[PDB]
Design a protein around this ligand. Structure first.
Ligand SMILES: N[C@@H](Cc1c[nH]c[nH+]1)C(=O)O
Ligand SMILES: N[C@@H](Cc1c[nH]c[nH+]1)C(=O)O
Ligand SMILES: N[C@@H](Cc1c[nH]c[nH+]1)C(=O)O
Ligand SMILES: N[C@@H](Cc1c[nH]c[nH+]1)C(=O)O
Ligand SMILES: N[C@@H](Cc1c[nH]c[nH+]1)C(=O)O
Ligand SMILES: N[C@@H](Cc1c[nH]c[nH+]1)C(=O)O
Ligand SMILES: [Mg+2]
Ligand SMILES: [Mg+2]
Ligand SMILES: [Mg+2]
Ligand SMILES: [Mg+2]
Ligand SMILES: [Mg+2]
Ligand SMILES: [Mg+2]
Lengths: 147, 147, 147, 147, 147, 147
RNA sequence: UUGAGUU
RNA sequence: UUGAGUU
RNA sequence: UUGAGUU
RNA sequence: UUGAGUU
RNA sequence: UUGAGUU
RNA sequence: UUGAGUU
């Protein structure tokens, strides 16, 4: 059962979709026990998007830098989020398109039961389009996994 | 070029994620010239999700009830939104999973140039999981198309 | 090397797109040594499309009715043709859409070298759309396989 | 309801699958109000195929060179046509295969009702195979979208 | 780093492919600390395959019957295994095909580092084909996930 | 009907999953009439995996070096095997992952009826992961086709 | 169309 | 890793 | 959950 | 073709 | 197998 | 954009 006040997906998205000069939403989430990471990446190569998210998550301490387990969890969460962004073919430059994204990675337990342990949510928001400024529209993606 | 104050995707998602009893965001969006539709649907059949969105959009006047053009635009926008929700296989019951969703459909011009005409965004948010209450996690999907 | 006068794909499509009452293209193709089958099928169930094509092919003698080999070749050729028709998700009714198709199955050697043996082409043409007459557009699909 | 004499998909394919030294089929379609573009492109990179179609369509006046709306419509129509060509994975060189294609882009209203506005069809025909002349078979793809 | 003597994938597959009446490989694996489950299921409905695997895994104690975490891990491992079996479209009956499978689910730590925790492997082996005995060929699938 | 003693899929996998210094399993299969090829390939480019399998199969005489028919059969069998390895997106480096594989290609008739002719099985086993030694897990894939 | 559900 | 780009 | 099936 | 690799 | 259909 | 190519 998901705890209404701990909906990791909704929280990650609301954080990513805000632009307040000083909302202190990060410190607030962290005070509540969440591990948070925010970043931005633009590219015509999906691997660069994946790497940016991984590197930011490890530097911010959202997931362990050592071992495979947590990296495995984050990779699959990122893949799931990329599905929403790419919608069918997980390709960018090869299909003549580019993305400009902001991302958020949140880690914690969104359930009422503490036995559910930690989960991770990767949320993406930005634009996708032809490699010409302006010829683009918005894109979103959210991936959730246990960790 | 997307107009900062008219980002259809971001606006549709923000509307979907708010539970304010008396927010009046719908009237505000409509005042700004947007055509808006909000609804909810849960099912183990993707076709029921698609139908709920189409029916709600036509009843609320977001898209024309007659003709094919606008229905065609809405169908593909819905398909794109479903990619984020299903992440790989656009199947629910056949893969032993069910979804409970809230949706928003927004229609208007998000660009600086009026020549870009109307576009439509279909946003979905809820939970996806096994057919047992509680064995689920959040899911999101956003599809954008010209109309 | 494909023989210019024996392009199985192009020939199957041309046969499918002609509505000439008394064309006699079938007899002409058969005179050239091709095994040909023409049919029609409409449905919201992909399996009914596959079955119609298989049954027609076996009844007309385009592929052997006994054994698995030729049925295996035809099944995969049909799957490839369905990709062009469905474009992403090989689903019809489950995604609230229906198809009305005409199909042609051609069998023979399209290469200059006789050692290439027989190949088979499955071509589909018709309309796909919402379950309401008129809310539809054209669809095409061609699958080619060795047999 | 599709107008029998204005079936954009069938017309685009019949144009592409003809090789008459002088059929004047282009001028005929244009006389009937259709905007037409014909071209050819070969590559192991899908983005080069997409770009060739876009550039030819804009140079021939089939779609507006300015703005995003029409480019958006053409991109998705091209993606749909590529599904028929690639059948599963929208990849060429990465999967050790190459394509040699001829393409046609047709724009106009294929419906009886003028309210349906303009639609666009992208049709592809050629060969796909290993990067060795002769080790190939035919391939086809048709994508249709509103514009 | 995977431990040579604890390769969960290889071990699960070897267990699945052995028909030795009195092999006692299950007891041996359990002696080594692995949690093991073996079963069989045939169907034209993918959801029945998923359900059989889940039910067998929970009854045999390979994964916890309560909570979502472990069920979530098993579901995704099963999905990955199904990719190898279905190869493109995770559909059986809808594409006029049926499967007869034997499955094995193994749980334990395959790495040298104990900090990697438990992982789970779902392996499938059997036949897939038309709904007519004999018109079929073999199929395999292996999915691995952290748990 | 598949012959119990000639299950091409199971045989190819058991061969690949063995590491005996001298099992003479190759000569045994060859004595039984099977054409066999064993190899290994690691890469972040799927095309290199495909090429390694093709080249080894042609050098070992498992398939004809001349003509297209047999190369066509092997290519599609390899594609099917890659589905089990990639599980969703047939991409490696582009999705920031690499594979280290051993492969086996077996050719012969696995059915009781000699009329079924030759079939081919491509089996893959190894590891897939991030481009960092140790951050990986096992992967498997089996593709079967008529030839 | 007005948020689904058990193997 | 500190929001991409022209066929 | 204890290996499916006809167009 | 004679088992890949760091963001 | 002899061209489908309403949320 | 004016039909690609070898492991
Ligand atoms: N509209 C495309 C992006 C794009 C490529 N070229 C133009 N637009 C998408 O939905 O991903
Ligand atoms: N976790 C699945 C849903 C599910 C099915 N069973 C359990 N959970 C998903 O990501 O869609
Ligand atoms: N336009 C859809 C079919 C459809 C469903 N609903 C309306 N139209 C397609 O391209 O397949
Ligand atoms: N036959 C492959 C193309 C190919 C690659 N290598 C040999 N042939 C296809 O259907 O796309
Ligand atoms: N050959 C198909 C199964 C099948 C359906 N009909 C005949 N055979 C596969 O590879 O899945
Ligand atoms: N775990 C991924 C591979 C990977 C990439 N990065 C880390 N691991 C898979 O299943 O393919
Ligand atoms: Mg993995
Ligand atoms: Mg459409
Ligand atoms: Mg098969
Ligand atoms: Mg788009
Ligand atoms: Mg999940
Ligand atoms: Mg082929």
């Amino acid at each position: 059962t998901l705890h209404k006040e701990r909906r990791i997906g909704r929280l990650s998205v609301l954080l990513l979709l805000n632009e307040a000069e000083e909302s202190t939403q990060v410190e607030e989430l962290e005070r509540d026990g969440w591990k948070v990471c925010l970043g931005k990446v633009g590219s015509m190569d999906a691997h660069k998007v994946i790497a940016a998210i991984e590197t930011a998550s490890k530097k911010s301490g959202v997931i362990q830098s050592e071992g495979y387990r947590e990296s495995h969890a984050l990779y699959h969460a990122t893949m799931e989020a990329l599905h929403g962004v790419t919608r069918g073919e997980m390709l960018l430059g090869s299909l003549l398109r580019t993305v400009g994204l902001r991302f958020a990675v949140l880690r914690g337990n969104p359930y009422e039961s503490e036995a559910e342990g930690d989960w991770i949510a990767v949320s993406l928001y930005g634009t996708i389009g032809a490699p010409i400024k302006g010829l683009e529209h918005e894109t979103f993606g959210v991936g959730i996994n246990h960790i």
